[PDB]
């Protein structure tokens, strides 16, 4: 047996999640903190895939300008995720972890291209899979790419780490009586206009019935606990 | 002043030149002024190639970690260099300029691979060439990529834009009687222990008989004056 | 003059099939190519996206005990064949054609490059896109919407069996009425079917004007370009 | 135990259609998967090549006023679609497979690299080659011959409608007999049609042993591996 | 005026060596460059294929008994070096040239793409093809034929050591008879050697006109373009 | 072979000029020379060394027709890079003939012909006991074979770059012109630059200096020398360290 309720998982973060208290880039304490959480999880036996957005890098008036071409912007954003994946990889490897970064667009000798069968193979070998450049196409979000990769690797759980720990009744940072759901249907999310991922991202996850755990990673040990089946955050799953 | 003293030029800038007063990224007003200067040069009949570093993006304790794997850092810098090239391409195109971004490492639909023959014909067609990612090799400096590309395109002049306007025999910011050199031999630079460019890049430039102008972009029209033979900053040329 | 300068038209692929139960019907593709040249010759810039349902067919090819990803690839592959067929058909009529693909294949089809695709269009070349998005779990609709956004299309046209968007069920109901035009939010409220959720959000977010219609008689496309009201027009916040 | 260590089995595309007239008949492909898995289970390192005629069919696709490079390109893709189908059939029965294409198509299958292909066979993986030679104007048989030679196969098997090479048409002239064994030169002199000229020249120049046979009844493959004289064996210099 | 508008000229690599034992003789390669540019200026669209035997030679390189895939790869690489030298010589004389290879090699030589190749030819550039077919076990002649057919050449010219196809060795026998014209079928019937079997079949199945000839003296290539009957013409049926 | 206890260098890169392969001939590869070299490399590996190889292209890119005095240097560097791929292929073949596992990795992509260089993959081949053969230098014109060798050595974490030359080591003065000339056992990177000693071209030497790559300049004068160096023998000249 395994001691995990979930064996193969894709954990998705914002690029800012790396930023800590700074205004750009990566806080080393934070990334190192996160590397430890991740290695703890795989050591418990979990097969771990990581997806990290690029908003800590592709940001500011000059880079993420409203007057920049959108495709141009999305490419810059993709390139940013590659840069974050490289940093995550290094932080992990310094801890003795085995890591493979795969991008949705080919970049020679900096990382490997995503090949579904190979990704799976790295995972079945206990390597951490880090996915960059999302879908490889502009006009698609990091969530889209996370969802795509979770389905392709046959992940049992997509975890999306957010500022808010769960999908609430109604935005807690503006309402102190907001009630977080323990679990929800894909259809109940739509029915009530809850915001969870962008439309396209959510439709993709919904179409394969990807179990979707929304939560806040604002405390050490939270991941392992979730892998041991802890009902932390909100589980989105199933029809209605 | 119609006729050019220099017909095909390669201009090299640090990434932090794009940053302006900020502490990361790109200041849209700075990149606009840069674009304006480049177009001015091109409209006077110069064939212009650009190389811009990545230090405005690959920065901070978490990205340019003081103890990270060097290959990983260099790869990160290379990707930063592509992000800057895309933003340079955008600013130029908004001004009516024709531009082609070529990279030492190919990345589909974001930048073509460098091909010497195609680069040269882009210039003959009046297109501005932007080179990203250096030599494509870690352990090589942006200066090295600049010298290599200059030689490969047969540039008549390699220009390195620095904060300080030329090479000083002291250092004009923290010293009263600093003296600027007008023109120096490659050998005079070394003999006088002057710090102009890393040993490998400097040697490449030297062996290829490439005139090198170190200068500050201190006011509008400097580039154009240099193209008309003006003696701004310092010329490194010849030997002994 | 022209109501739409640059358009992308997406076909299902069985649209190539004709009365046949398989592959392609030569007479129905010549007619198809005839309409396309007509529109370009009228000064329009044309991009084509065709599905692979005519080739990716049957219990053996399209099964359900099949790895979805590999079925998706078989579909992409099958869109590249159709593209080559159309390309051949258009070129025999002296039209200039460039097939570009989400997945690159040497000396069969070009890789997709936004700036290059557009410069082909501007040069009067017909652009055929294959393999959609390049990702499994994504429809031909998504692929078409993406490319049309990428090339700054003025209109995405989507040929279907049924001309226009339903009020009821054109095929057993009798009294039905096609909406002339619609809003993206009107389609979403009334729960009408236009494209799949993902493709449709992608279109909306870029306010891609989309015309759902049926190509029956020779001229329909050309008329639409001169401005008409054939089928349904989905647009606006 | 094995009369052949490493084999390449070549099938035409229509072998897949079965009773239908395009695509793949699921029953017919399944039977094939089983025979292949039996061969590999017996200790044989197996490679396969399947043509595209079952998919690149019809007056619309495989025309005759068409560009030849185009139609060859259409056939090449069709061989990849067949390879993918065969791949999933083999995997649904517990086999390790690797699809390798003469033309690069990322994320759908591997590029053919000879050294890698061999490395695969010796892991017990079955190799499936698509897109033939990668070049137009070359036959599926040429692709099969070239790959059989590159991997150092002991046997190229070619499954066909007729269970061997005959002195005459056995569907039109009973009394026609099957050769048990011909040399390459025997074939050339008797004007016997086996493979197209180029493909046969390729095989002859490397003395590739050739088995022409039919796969009508189950166990043929295993029988051949143990040493049965099924079909016609072509090899040697006259 | 012009009897052939699009041609492919095939040479062996030794043709660039001159009297040397290896590599390239600069005087010899400069004469061939003129000879090529002369054709181009006459209005001919000219493609070139040059073998590698001037480079891939000696017991160390062309090791009679080394892995054949390996030595064919070493051969393909040699053709690329020659292509680069031919290109340099040609451009030095003011010509526009494009080297295309069956094997992609970045910033050295383009991927071969049929439509692009014709377009280059249409714009007045000389097309140099290297690396043959891209497959081991195929000859330089095979790659020449495939290329000539892919680009729609009206003539494939094979420069060889004797000026045509002969009854017997003309260097030992002043008695020898040269054939002006031969059919593809006569060549096979009389057992004359023109190209290897696979290459010959490839050219025959597209009825590619072949001119086997000696580049003995300057101007021969222009003359041929104007209808001169030099060496031997192979064409046609029965 | 020998015990892993005796290894003074675990991962090495050996660099040779292409002409080291020609032997007596004025072109290409002398079968006797290349077979000898494979034996030296196999013996190094059997002693537990992880061996990487870099051979230049001057045995093939030579003569007035190829290495033309007045020719475009870029196209001549390209021709030279292709020549190194050819030499690597021959080396692969000789080595595999003697039962070694080999991988050829090129700085320039050439599909089917050889693998593209990728650092992580190269390290993995080495730790799997395979010989790594690097071809095509840094992948860029205007860079010496020594530069490609230094870069590769640093990328794979070599404990030693060995550079085989005609002269076995670095001398205080030209030996053939100074019966007095003496051969340094070891030098610092700074002593080299200070005395104007010639070890590599400037760019290659700065790459190696900046990573402090240990450099052993030596002559492969008689068989067994490589293996002796691997067990700590003081042969040729060690360049390492600072000040």
HEC letters along chain D: CCCCCEEEEEECHHHHCCCCCCCCCHHHHHHHHHHHHHHHHCCCEEEEEECCCCCCCHHHHCCCCCCHHHHHHHHHHHHHHHHHHHHHHHHCCCCCEEEEECCCCCCCCEECCHHHHHHHHCCCCEEEEECCCCCCCCCHHHHHHHHHHHCCCCEEEEECCCCCCECCCCCCCCCCCECCEECHHHHHHHCCCCCCHHHHHHHHHCCCCEEEECCCCCCHHHHHHHCCCCCEEECCCC
Task: Give the CB-side neighbour count of residue D77, counting CA atoms within 13 A.
Answer: 34
- CB-CB under 8 Å, C103 with D77: no
Judging contacts by C-beta atoms under 8 Å, the chain E residues touching residue D198 are: 197-198, 201-202
Chains E and C touch (3+ CB pairs under 8 A): yes
> What is the C-alpha radius of gyration for chain A, rounded to an integer number of angstroms?
17
C106 in reach of chain E (CB within 8 A): yes
DSSP state for residue C179 in the 8-state scheme: -
Please report residues of C whose CB lies closer than 8 A to that of E134: none
The DSSP bridge pattern shows strands F237-239 and F215-218 to be antiparallel
Instruction: At C203, list the tokens.
Output: 């279109």
For the CA atoms of A134, A135, A141, A144, what is the dihedral angle to 10 degrees? Answer: -100
Cα–Cα separations (whole angstroms), residue C170 to A37, C174, C234, F8: 57, 7, 19, 84
Q: Give, in order, the Cα–Cα distances in Å from E62 to each of D193, F86, F87.
A: 35, 11, 12
- D52 among the known binding-site residues? yes
Q: Are A69 and B90 in contact (CB under 8 A)?
A: yes
Q: How far apart are CA F109 and CA A92, in angstroms?
A: 30
> Residue F54's domain is classified under what CATH number?
3.40.1160.10
Partnered with residue B102 across adjacent β-strands are B112, B131
Determine the Cα–Cα distance for residues C5 and B51; give it in Å rounded to an integer: 37
Of the candidates E100, E64, E194, E62, the residue with the CA atom closest to the CA atom of residue E141: E194
Mutate to test the interface with E, among C107, C108, C110, C120 (most CBs of E within 10 A): C107
The phi-psi region of residue C62 (left if phi > 0; otherwise alpha if psi is between -120 and 50; otherwise beta) is: beta
Is residue B106 within 8 A of residue B133, CB to CB? The reply is no
Q: Are F212 and F241 in contact (CB under 8 A)?
A: yes
> B180: helix, coil or strand?
strand
d(CA A1, CA C80): 46
Distance from C-alpha of E212 to C-alpha of E165, rounded to nearest angstrom: 7
Residue pair D8/D49 in contact (Cβ under 8 Å)? The answer is yes
Asked if D232 contacts D187 with a C-beta cutoff of 8 angstroms, the reply is no
How distant is the alpha carbon of residue A43 from its chain centre? 19
Chain F interface disruption, residue of E60, E84, E97, E106, most F CBs within 10 A: E60
Provide the greatest CA pair distance for chain C: 52
Angle F63-F69-F70 from CA coordinates, rounded to 5°: 135
Residue B124 at interface with chain E, using a CB cutoff of 8 Å: no
SS3 C39: helix
Measured in whole angstroms, how far is the alpha carbon of residue F98 from the centre of its chain?
21
D136 is in an annotated binding site: yes
Q: What distance in Å separates residue E196's CA from the closest CA in chain D?
A: 9
Q: Where does A44-182 have alpha helices with state H?
A: 70-93, 116-124, 142-152
CA–CA separation, F86 and F89 (whole Å)? 5
Token pair 């340019």 is found at B64
Q: Please state, in angstroms and rounded to a whole number, the distance separating the CA atoms of residues B11 and B215.
A: 11
F124 touches chain A (CB under 8 A): no
**Alpha carbons B90 and B31: distance in angstroms, whole number:** 10
The CA distances from residue F102 to B178, F132, F149, in Å, are: 58, 6, 18
Q: How far is CA C207 from CA C148, C159, F172, in A?
A: 11, 19, 77
Measure E203 CA to nearest chain B CA, in Å. 34
What residues contact F242, with CB distance under 8 A and at least 6 apart? Answer: F188, F189, F190, F212
Interface of A with B in 26-85 (CB under 8 A): 26-28, 30-31, 57-63, 65, 67-69, 72, 75-76, 78-80, 82-83
> Is A121 touching D (CB cutoff 8 A)?
no
Among A59, A65, A110, the residue with its CB nearest the CB of B75 is A110
Helix, strand, or coil here: C6? Answer: strand
How many CA atoms lie within 13 Å of F75's alpha carbon, on the beta-carbon side? 23
Question: Can you read off the two tokens belonging to residue D54?
Answer: 């079952």
Min distance B203 CA to chain F CA atoms (Å): 6
Specify the 3-state DSSP secondary structure of E198. Answer: helix
What angle do helix axes F145-156 and F202-211 make, rounded to 10 degrees? Answer: 10
What span, in angstroms and rounded, lies between the C-alpha atoms of E115 and D73? 14
Known binding residue B137? Answer is: yes
Query: Can you give the three-state secondary structure of chain F, one letter per residue?
Result: CCCHHHCCCCEEEEEECHHHHCCCCCCCCCHHHHHHHHHHHHHHHHCCCEEEEEECCCCCCCCCCCCCCCCCHHHHHHHHHHHHHHHHHHHHHHHHHCCCCEEEEECCCECCCEEECCHHHHHHHHHCCCEEEEECCCCCCCCCHHHHHHHHHHHHCCCEEEEECCCCCCECCCHHHCCCCCECCEECHHHHHHHCCCCCCHHHHHHHHHHCCCEEEECCCCCCHHHHHHCCCCCCEEECCCC
Find the length of chain C: 237
Cα–Cα distance measured from residue C76 to residue A52, given in angstroms and rounded to the nearest whole number: 29
Is B60 within 8 Å of A25 when comparing Cβ atoms? Answer: yes
Beta pairing partners, A100 = A129
Assign residue E23 a region: left if phi > 0, alpha if psi is -120 to 50, beta otherwise? left
Provide the number of structural domains found in chain C: 1
Method for this entry? X-ray
3-state secondary structure A71-110: HHHHHHHHHHHHHHHHHHHHHHHCCCCCEEEEECCCCCCC
Please state, as a whole number, how many other Cβ atoms lie within 10 Å of the Cβ of residue D205.
Answer: 15
In Å, what resolution does this model reach?
A: 2.3
- Structural domain that includes position D23: 1-238
- Whether A143 has a binding-site annotation, put simply, is no
Cα–Cα distance, E182 to F138 (Å, whole number) = 52
Angle at B175 between CA B172 and CA B180, to 5 degrees: 35
Walk across the sheet containing D126-130 and list its strands.
D110-111, D97-101, D126-130, D45-50, D6-11, D155-159, D210-213, D232-234, D181-182
Burial class of residue E190 (count of CB atoms within 10 Å of its CB; 0-12, 13-18, 19+): exposed
Residue D158 token pair: 């070619």
CA nearest to F198, candidates F233, F239, F150 = F239
d(CA F31, CA E178): 42
* Residue C79 vs residues C130, D82, D124: alpha-carbon distances, Å: 5, 15, 33
Q: Does D23 contact chain C (CB < 8 Å)? A: yes
Determine whether the interchain pair E106/B116 forms a contact, defined as Cβ–Cβ distance below 8 Å.
Answer: no
Which chains are within 8 Å of B by 3+ CB pairs?
A, C, E, F
Chain F residues touching E80 at Cβ < 8 A = 82
């Amino acid at each position: 047996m395994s001691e995990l309720s979930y064996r193969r998982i894709l954990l998705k973060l914002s690029g800012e999640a790396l930023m800590g208290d700074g205004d750009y880039g990566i806080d080393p304490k934070v990334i190192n903190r996160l590397a430890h959480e991740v290695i703890e999880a795989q050591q418990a036996g979990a097969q771990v895939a990581l997806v990290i957005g690029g908003g800590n890098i592709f940001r500011g008036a000059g880079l993420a300008a409203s007057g920049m071409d959108r495709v141009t912007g999305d490419h810059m954003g993709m390139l940013a995720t590659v840069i974050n994946a490289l940093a995550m990889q290094d932080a992990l490897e310094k801890l003795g972890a085995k890591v493979r970064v795969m991008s949705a667009i080919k970049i020679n000798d900096v990382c490997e291209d995503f090949i579904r069968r190979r990704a799976i193979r790295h995972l079945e070998k206990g390597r951490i899979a880090i996915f960059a450049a999302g879908t490889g196409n502009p006009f698609f979000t990091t969530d889209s790419g996370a969802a795509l990769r979770a389905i392709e690797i046959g992940a049992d759980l997509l975890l999306k780490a957010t500022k808010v720990d769960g999908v609430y009744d109604k935005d807690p940072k503006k309402h102190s009586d907001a009630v977080r759901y323990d679990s929800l249907t894909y259809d109940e999310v739509i029915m009530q206009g809850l915001e969870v991922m962008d439309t396209a991202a959510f439709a993709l996850a919904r179409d394969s019935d990807l179990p979707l755990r929304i939560f806040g990673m604002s405390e050490p040990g939270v991941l392992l606990r979730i892998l041991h089946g802890a009902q932390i955050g909100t589980l989105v799953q199933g029809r209605s």
